[PDB]
Amino acid sequence: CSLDNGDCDQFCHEEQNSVVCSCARGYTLADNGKACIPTGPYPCGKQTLE
Amino acid sequence: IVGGQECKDGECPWQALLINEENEGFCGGTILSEFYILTAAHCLYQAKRFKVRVGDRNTEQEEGGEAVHEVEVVIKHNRFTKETYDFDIAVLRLKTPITFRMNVAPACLPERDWAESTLMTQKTGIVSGFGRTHEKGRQSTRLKMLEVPYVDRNSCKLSSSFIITQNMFCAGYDTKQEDACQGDSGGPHVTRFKDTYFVTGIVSWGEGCARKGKYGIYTKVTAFLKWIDRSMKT
Ligand SMILES: NS(=O)(=O)N1C[C@H](C(=O)Nc2ccc(Cl)cc2)[C@@H](C(=O)Nc2ccc(-n3ccccc3=O)cc2F)C1
Ligand SMILES: [Ca+2]
Ligand code: NA
């Protein structure tokens, strides 16, 4: 996870000499297993738009 | 906030304001979820009774989105003491849930190890609030934000009259006249990673505001992630 954050959008951990991405509550890991997908209209940590 | 600028609509949605009986703001808070607000333990000593306002950006005008919430439970860290200002953290459970909307959304809580190695190593964080715009000056009627660089723990300790503990971290500028200030206390310090903002600190204390050779001191949220999780599960 040392560089590029394991290509993870949010959390990165090394599970068995291998990169594992994960996300904050209110998000779901995307098919690519790197991006994080919000579950609702106001997911945590995102600035709001009208 | 000294220096910095006014937040735009939806730019600092996790900001909360603690208001006293006089309906006057005296500390900030950070929205963690529909029922919980993160703030500083020292703030709880200022007003016997207080409520929480969310969605406000101008305290002199009532605008769409502002809402007031009563606090149901106050969970103050049992090791907080004004002697050292260590463990300056508290969680508030509200009586009724916050409805997220434009200007009202929670900041994300990060995973501990990742936050320590990836978030706390970023160059800057963002602090915001309705506090004084100058040391001993008037509180801001508008919500302000300020980008503040993380400061090396050792440089900070050398600059400080008081002990900097592992439950704190420093941020700000040596001489540039920008800093958080009294009144911003309890408020959010967030760090953006890619396109998500994570709460990393709680505005805690400082010697004056924006003083040359002094920095802003924040409660290090990563040190309390398990405490927060336990506190949030009633
Ligand atoms: N009336 S004022 O001049 O505008 N105001 C500005 C200072 C402030 O809060 N700035 C400020 C600056 C930057 C940021 Cl991030 C937050 C607050 C505040 C103060 O002096 N706070 C303060 C100072 C020291 C400790 N402390 C720390 C260790 C041990 C014991 C101990 O008492 C606790 C404190 F409350 C007085
Ligand atoms: Ca207002
Ligand atoms: Na300074």
Side-chain angles (χ1 to χ4, degrees):
Chain A
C1 292
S2 305
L3 289 163
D4 293 300
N5 190 50
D7 299 294
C8 302
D9 255 33
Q10 293 188 359
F11 310 141
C12 182
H13 312 87
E14 55 154 299
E15 201 179 309
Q16 310 186 67
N17 296 62
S18 187
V19 162
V20 176
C21 301
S22 58
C23 314
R25 169 194 175 185
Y27 290 88
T28 305
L29 188 56
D31 297 300
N32 56 50
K34 296 180 180 180
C36 291
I37 309 301
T39 297
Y42 294 101
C44 72
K46 298 292 189 183
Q47 296 175 304
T48 66
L49 294 57
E50 292 230 293
Chain B
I1 302 293
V2 182
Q5 50 182 36
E6 286 175 43
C7 296
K8 307 179 192 70
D9 222 58
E11 193 176 9
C12 307
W14 33 76
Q15 179 80 47
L17 182 60
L18 309 187
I19 53 167
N20 58 28
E21 294 296 67
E22 303 171 308
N23 310 291
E24 177 179 359
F26 64 91
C27 268
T30 305
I31 296 169
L32 294 187
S33 70
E34 68 185 323
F35 277 112
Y36 295 89
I37 303 301
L38 184 65
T39 190
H42 80 264
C43 283
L44 306 170
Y45 294 65
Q46 310 183 193
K48 175 182 178 181
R49 298 176 294 187
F50 64 89
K51 299 187 197 308
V52 175
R53 188 185 304 144
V54 298
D56 198 10
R57 284 178 51 242
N58 184 337
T59 62
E60 288 192 315
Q61 307 293 172
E62 294 184 72
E63 305 169 0
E66 291 172 49
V68 177
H69 284 265
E70 282 170 12
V71 181
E72 185 189 85
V73 184
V74 172
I75 308 190
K76 179 183 72 174
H77 201 289
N78 288 300
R79 296 186 65 188
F80 174 72
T81 170
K82 279 187 292 185
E83 184 185 59
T84 62
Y85 262 67
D86 199 6
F87 302 96
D88 192 12
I89 183 170
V91 163
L92 314 173
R93 184 186 166 85
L94 304 172
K95 294 194 179 176
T96 65
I98 290 163
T99 302
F100 299 145
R101 50 194 183 272
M102 175 67 187
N103 286 317
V104 186
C108 298
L109 282 173
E111 180 277 310
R112 193 190 65 186
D113 303 327
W114 179 81
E116 273 288 75
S117 64
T118 305
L119 282 183
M120 304 302 294
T121 49
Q122 291 290 285
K123 175 170 181 301
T124 69
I126 298 295
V127 61
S128 59
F130 291 89
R132 299 181 190 275
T133 60
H134 176 275
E135 184 178 319
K136 295 175 193 179
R138 276 186 176 183
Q139 291 198 298
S140 180
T141 54
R142 303 304 190 78
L143 178 54
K144 290 177 72 179
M145 58 187 281
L146 172 68
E147 181 169 302
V148 286
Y150 278 99
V151 173
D152 175 81
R153 180 173 301 276
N154 301 294
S155 295
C156 189
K157 291 184 165 171
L158 286 182
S159 75
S160 178
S161 302
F162 308 101
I163 292 160
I164 302 302
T165 73
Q166 55 171 36
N167 298 314
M168 310 171 186
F169 69 92
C170 314
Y173 301 99
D174 179 357
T175 55
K176 188 184 184 181
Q177 292 295 296
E178 294 198 300
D179 190 15
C181 196
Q182 183 172 64
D184 292 318
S185 326
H189 171 286
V190 300
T191 299
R192 179 181 54 65
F193 184 75
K194 289 185 64 61
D195 198 280
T196 304
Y197 287 87
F198 292 89
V199 55
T200 37
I202 300 166
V203 180
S204 189
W205 59 274
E207 297 189 62
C209 294
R211 283 193 194 170
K212 177 179 181 180
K214 290 287 173 295
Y215 301 103
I217 320 295
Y218 300 77
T219 300
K220 191 193 299 176
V221 173
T222 59
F224 297 102
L225 292 170
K226 290 186 180 174
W227 181 88
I228 285 166
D229 290 317
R230 189 179 181 180
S231 294
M232 281 179 78
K233 295 176 185 179
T234 303

